[PDB]
Design a binder for this molecule. Structure first.
Ligand SMILES: [Zn+2]
Length: 273
DNA sequence: AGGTAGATCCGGACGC
DNA sequence: GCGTCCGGATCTACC
């Protein structure tokens, strides 16, 4: 899940949990719990708190409780559902928050990559994993100037730059490839090689792409669904991601796939320069 | 130096 | 049955 997927989950999850009071927290894979590292302390401190809100920072969900914030990263396969305490759990359910009304918030994660950190609300923003995060891309804090300031300093691939959460929050393998295609920039270009005009174009397309994907409920390419189990529709608007060997929608040249910045990387060798 | 590729955490889908 | 793939992202060897 990237920004648009996490945003859609946030929007669809909040009304199912707001105002509910935690009665128990059960943990079946303790490695998910990162702070407090002792999963018994993590569970104990959340009991008796009520869900007051649900925010997103980058790819993180921030559950606002009474005194605490719970910071959750779904990573590759993490997802939340709300269901009755009377039903058997689905496979790969690793954390369960039981509410006083007999419902439960269930965290499922086949690959177990997800993370959870709990801190007092006033501390969460100055501690990991939120502390290092770059600006929200749909905010004034992300501008071409902010992008150029990081780009000019490094010969790393522009893909590696955009995947770096300290540069800008929220972009992952899909939206990086898509933004670069739309901006006409090859993903292996050294960041410092981008012209002033290329940086402006890239910022514009990043903002447009993420915005569009939010409006479409995210991209369902393998396993992503919203909290109601509904697929997104942005996958029908992809120019390059997952389209290797198919014609470019713009020029008909076959889309190519390589590895860049350690990730599968999709591009049109004609439209991107 | 600082960028890149491999290893790691993890396990299911998929094609051959 | 067996590599390889995967909306994340660290660390660790290499130059
Ligand atoms: Zn093209």
């Amino acid at each position: 899940p990237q920004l648009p997927e996490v945003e859609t989950i946030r929007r669809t999850l909040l009304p199912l949990i707001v105002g509910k009071t935690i009665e128990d927290v059960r943990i079946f894979w303790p490695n998910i719990i990162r702070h407090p590292r002792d999963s018994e302390a993590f569970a104990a401190r959340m009991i008796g708190q009520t869900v007051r809100g649900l925010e997103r920072r980058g790819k993180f969900l921030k559950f606002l409780l009474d005194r605490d914030a719970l910071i959750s990263h779904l990573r590759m396969e993490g997802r939340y559902a709300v269901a009755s305490a009377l039903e058997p759990l689905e496979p790969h359910t690793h954390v369960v928050f039981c509410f006083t009304d007999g419902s439960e918030l269930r965290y499922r994660d086949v690959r177990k990559f997800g993370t959870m950190h709990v801190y007092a609300k006033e501390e969460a923003d100055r501690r990991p994993p939120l502390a290092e995060l770059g600006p929200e891309p749909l905010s004034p804090a992300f501008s071409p100037a902010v992008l150029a300031e990081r780009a000019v300093k490094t010969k790393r691939s522009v893909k590696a730059l955009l995947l770096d959460c300290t540069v800008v929050a929220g972009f992952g393998n899909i939206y990086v490839d898509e933004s670069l295609f739309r901006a006409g920039i090859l993903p292996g270009r050294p960041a410092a090689s981008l012209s002033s005009k290329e940086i402006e174009r890239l910022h514009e397309e990043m903002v447009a792409t993420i915005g569009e994907a939010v409006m479409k409920g995210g991209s369902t390419v393998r396993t992503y669904v919203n909290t109601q189990g509904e697929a997104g529709t942005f996958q029908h608007h992809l120019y390059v991601y997952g389209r290797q060997g198919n014609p470019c929608k713009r020029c008909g040249t076959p889309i190519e796939k390589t590895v860049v910045a350690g990730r599968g990387t999709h591009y049109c060798p004609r439209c991107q320069r």
